[PDB]
From Swiss-Prot, chain B:
Part of the full-length chain shown: 295 to 343 of 1370
Subunit structure: Homomultimer. Makes the hexons and eleven out of twelve pentons. Interacts with triplex proteins 1/TRX1 and 2/TRX2; adjacent capsomers are linked together in groups of three by triplexes, heterotrimeric complexes composed of one molecule of TRX1 and two molecules of TRX2. Interacts with scaffold protein; this interaction allows efficient MCP transport to the host nucleus. Interacts with capsid vertex component 2/CVC2. Interacts with the small capsomere-interacting protein/SCP.
Species this protein is from: Human cytomegalovirus (strain AD169)
Location of this chain's protein in the cell: Virion; Host nucleus
Residue ranges crossing the lipid bilayer per the database entry: none
Function comment: Self-assembles to form an icosahedral capsid with a T=16 symmetry, about 200 nm in diameter, and consisting of 150 hexons and 12 pentons (total of 162 capsomers). Hexons form the edges and faces of the capsid and are each composed of six MCP molecules. In contrast, one penton is found at each of the 12 vertices. Eleven of the pentons are MCP pentamers, while the last vertex is occupied by the portal complex.
Family listed: Belongs to the herpesviridae major capsid protein family.
Protein name: Major capsid protein
Amino acid sequence: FEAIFGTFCNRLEWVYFLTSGLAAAAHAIKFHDLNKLTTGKMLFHVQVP
Amino acid sequence: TVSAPATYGNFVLSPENAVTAISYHSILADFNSYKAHLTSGQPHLPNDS
């Protein structure tokens, strides 16, 4: 038995979020319970001069 | 009384297809990086004998 051959090319350009300059705008947090969370809220109290 | 084959025949890999693989590697491998085609001692093709 004799075979017919083919070639695989495997190289890729890897990219990462934290290395990007766009990441500077973000504050990156991991939270493994995010599926349970419905809405996150953040509230402020201000008095005027 | 008749002498008959005691067992089934085997899959045998053609020695030629090593040459095709080596040609593909010659095209694809880096400059002088490939070395499997040259060796010392008796030459040896991968076989199931």
